[PDB]
């Protein structure tokens, strides 16, 4: 089929900035016979359906702010948010409809940049009454960092542990454009009481030297 | 006021079958193209096919002309898609999306608020709720571990809905077993441990379980 391809895959803008997406055809969706470009794009925020910004590759949708604006032609497309408000972070869809199969680019999400903070790190071990239940989870939490990009690397005893553990991010905080990080370690009660130092290791650009918050079973 | 009205959340299991709906109204329903097309977790949107509302004539992308059969009932104004020998990868959320012409080529102007489907071979399950302990800079964090349920979703609030800065409620995780795992955490003044009460509220409606964990510290 036609496919579509967005470039960024993510991108960081400060709030009154300029944002720039561009978008790529494996083939051609201008008609020579209509003279119109075959192309829409989307504004999706989490939990909710697409909406149109833009149709005909360059029109915008009525209520859409003009703030958004799209240009290009035959294969290259470009969405440009002229100057980024807060409810503009999103993620946005290219769409072609020249012919079936529609089919999408693979999506750019866009956020609020801002200047770098270090997480805060917070490790939690297992509750007892979740250890009669024979299984045991180790939490770390990462809490109100910038940018998104963090390595958390569980070490029991210090042999770096893999294939273990489970990661969750929260959406760019609305107040002060943080991020925060949930990872859980994983082990039967069995090999829980088995070892004893239990640490994470977090690294992150705000973070001079990679922390390390720990805990020995047994406090 | 142009309107579609997509059925309730499904849940199923390997192998089965599945059947959505979307209602229609506040426009002709014979003279705009239906389309589907679903979107798997934090994936891109996929075009499932489409249906010429007037003469109920369809196609599909290759992909799915296997199993996918799309429908509509013009004195109800209602379309269908029904997606069969169902697998965990068709786990997504399936939008029905107006085209812009009656016809395919064109963009959708509207799209239904969406329908989730989960295919697992887990059963209904609710959830056990284990305090992520505050530990005795200048703040500490404290949190529920809410584990191994099935299936989404789950909702947490602190304290009935009064503590809601520097909550922190994390998108879930689903783990080897099948069951699903999330947290929720928030941070407050090391000063206000022993004294303030902290507690989560956690709701489960898919397994009627409404649950509420005071959190302390541990001895």
């Known amino acids: 089929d036609i496919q579509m391809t967005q470039s960024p895959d993510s991108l960081a803008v400060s709030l009154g900035e300029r944002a720039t997406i561009n978008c790529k055809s494996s083939?051609?969706?201008?008609?020579?016979?209509?003279?119109?470009?075959?192309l829409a794009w989307y504004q999706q925020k989490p939990g909710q359906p697409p909406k149109v910004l833009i149709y005909?590759?360059?029109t915008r949708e009525s209520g859409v702010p003009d703030r958004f604006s799209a240009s290009g032609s035959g294969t290259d497309f470009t969405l440009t948010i002229s100057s980024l408000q807060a409810a503009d972070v999103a993620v946005y869809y290219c769409?072609?409809?020249?012919?079936?199969?529609?089919?999408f680019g693979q999506g750019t999400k866009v956020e609020i940049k801002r200047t770098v903070a270090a997480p805060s790190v917070f490790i939690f071990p297992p509750s007892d009454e979740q250890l009669k239940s024979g299984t045991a989870s180790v939490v770390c939490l990462l809490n109100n960092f910038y940018p998104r990009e963090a390595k958390v690397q569980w070490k029991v005893d210090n042999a770096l542990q893999s294939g273990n553990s489970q990661e969750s991010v929260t959406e760019q905080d609305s107040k002060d454009s943080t991020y925060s990080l949930s990872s859980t370690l994983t082990l039967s009660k069995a090999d829980y009481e088995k070892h004893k130092v239990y640490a994470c290791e977090v690294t992150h650009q705000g973070l001079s030297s990679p922390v390390t918050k720990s805990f020995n079973r047994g406090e | 006021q142009v309107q579609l009205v997509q059925s309730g959340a499904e849940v199923k299991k390997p192998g089965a079958s599945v059947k959505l709906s979307c209602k229609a109204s506040?426009?002709?329903?014979?003279?705009?193209?239906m389309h589907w097309v679903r979107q798997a977790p934090g994936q891109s949107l996929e075009w499932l096919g489409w249906?010429?509302?007037?003469?109920?004539?369809?196609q599909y992308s290759q992909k799915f002309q296997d199993r996918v059969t799309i429908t509509r009932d013009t004195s109800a104004r209602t379309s269908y898609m029904e997606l069969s020998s169902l697998r965990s990868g068709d786990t997504a959320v399936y939008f029905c999306?107006?085209?812009?012409?009656?016809?395919?080529?064109?963009?959708?102007?509207?799209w239904g608020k969406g329908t989730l489907v989960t295919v697992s071979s887990a059963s209904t399950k609710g959830p056990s709720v284990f305090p992520l302990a505050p530990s005795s800079g200048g703040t500490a964090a404290l949190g529920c571990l809410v584990k191994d349920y099935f299936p989404e979703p789950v909702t947490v609030s602190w304290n009935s809905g009064a503590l809601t800065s520097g909550v922190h409620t994390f998108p879930a995780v689903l783990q080897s077993s099948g069951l699903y795992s999330l947290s929720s955490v928030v941070t407050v003044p090391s000063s206000s441990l022993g004294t303030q009460t902290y507690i989560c509220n956690v709701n489960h409606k898919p397994s009627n379980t409404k649950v509420d964990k005071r959190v302390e510290p541990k001895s």
């Open positions: 999306a107006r085209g812009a012409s009656w016809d395919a080529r064109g963009w959708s102007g509207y």
């Open positions: 506040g426009y002709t329903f014979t003279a705009y193209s």
């Open positions: 249906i010429n509302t007037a003469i109920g004539n369809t």
């Open positions: 083939q051609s969706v201008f008609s020579s016979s209509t003279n119109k470009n075959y």
């Open positions: 005909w590759s360059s």
């Open positions: 769409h072609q409809y020249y012919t079936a199969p529609w089919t």
